Symmetry: C2
Subunit: 274 residues, 2 copies
């Protein structure tokens, strides 16, 4: 089985062409392949399939390291788009794909970045889910003794975004866990710590739901920019610097989808025995 | 650059044929390649070279994930011997090789395992290094309130081997880091927890110097059997069961080299563009 190893800002994938190859997985096999010493070594497996539909170019599925299928992953989307172009499975700039989260068009740019339509940010508390009276630009939250001002938004997953003076001194290790499982977040939240450098440039650290600080959370980058836009702090195109590198977010506000442009690195190609 | 990913039940290798292609590394490139997320992901890099002496079939060298060269007897030997055969660099089953540790003959058995001559175990405390009055078969060591009885031996690297009733109930997690950096080991020690099942069979867990428990430590398996042989507990041929699988150790005692036989698994082949 031919595969490619890729990463989107350090979130790493085994990617497989199941369009031109017969490719068979079981949950146990995926677990073995994910193992960094005994296998290929990856966070997620992305399998590329034919569309079975004349209005689609591909289908793709993503499996986690435990061998179960995953719903939305836009690091996934970027690796997918570059993979099908690098492997010659398509030559299209605008790639139509179906996924477990529905249908999408991905655009591969001239500088080999991939632009993802992440949908319209939903600020409605019930959609997050977030306990509040109603939607507000800024909420006051208590995190034990500390008073926190934040914005809260759903990108399909829940985000709490806090402005900080300096991401490097932000109390991520202490405030992150307290907010991630705060009583006001029935399904927990990703906690973003956002430093506004210019209206066009933020630095960001994200304490991810059930994971703690990660190198790059693309959905947190979208959420921080959506919140910062709504709060009057940010322009409509914003450079986001995460620990793993750069994303560029574009959003014209309510009534519009938010776009996330980011890299996908191709590390090596392999063939596995089996 | 073509490469193969392999392992010998424990630490994994990126293995590269520098015979049929030009292979160029820098310490920083090795570090980037070793990175599990951003690179290939491996503990060590094994480079297979043509021989520089007409008396040898190959030379090989090994670098760690920091990009510096490792010189440990038998390290990567099983993967090397299986690699040269599976890559069609040789058809020999007795393979003469030079390394940073000198020359060796490696033997690929009929069931595709590899037999490595690991040299003669050295029980001299100065060679470990180990602080002691003189070589003894058993030492008493202090670990918290607990008295530990152990044997101590060098296989090129330092080992402390403790006999336990059951590896599963062995206090590896607590006793292991205490012995690993014990003040009596100036350069730290690999800590073996050895359950003698019978004279020909042990179970073993190893808490490795600067890494904690691993799935298989070949040199730890050697050391455990050497110590068990010296202590009168073990036969000359011993099956060793580690969490990662099985090694077999043969040693006729002082005056003889110790031999370790074990598998190498080929996981996948790859190609990486290096600019």
């Amino acid at each position: 089985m031919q595969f490619s190893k890729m990463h989107g800002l350090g979130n790493d994938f085994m990617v497989v062409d199941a369009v031109t190859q017969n490719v068979f997985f079981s949950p146990e096999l995926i677990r073995r392949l994910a193992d960094r010493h005994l296998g290929v070594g990856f966070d997620q497996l992305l399998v590329v399939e034919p569309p079975y539909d004349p209005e689609l170019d591909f289908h793709y599925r993503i499996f986690n390291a435990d061998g179960s299928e995953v719903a939305q992953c836009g690091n996934g989307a970027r690796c997918f788009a570059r993979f099908v172009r690098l492997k010659g499975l398509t030559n299209k700039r605008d790639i139509r794909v179906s996924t477990a989260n529905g249908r999408m068009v991905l655009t591969v740019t001239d500088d080999d970045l991939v632009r993802v339509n992440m949908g319209e940010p939903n600020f409605e508390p019930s959609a997050v889910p977030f306990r509040a009276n109603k939607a507000e630009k800024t909420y006051i939250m208590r995190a034990a003794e500390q008073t926190i001002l934040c914005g809260v938004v759903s990108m399909g997953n829940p985000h709490c975004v806090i402005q900080v003076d300096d991401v490097d001194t932000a109390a991520v290790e202490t405030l992150g866990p307290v907010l991630e499982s705060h009583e006001r977040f029935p399904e927990r939240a990703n906690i973003g710590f956002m430093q506004v450098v210019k209206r066009e440039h933020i630095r960001l650290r994200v304490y991810e739901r059930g994971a703690g600080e990660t190198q790059a959370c693309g959905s947190g980058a979208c959420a921080a920019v959506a919140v910062g836009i709504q709060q009057g702090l940010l322009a409509e195109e914003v450079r986001v610097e995460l620990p793993g590198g750069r994303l560029d977010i574009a959003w014209k506000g309510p009534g519009h989808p938010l776009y996330m442009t980011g890299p996908a690195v191709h590390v090596y190609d392999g063939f596995i025995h089996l």
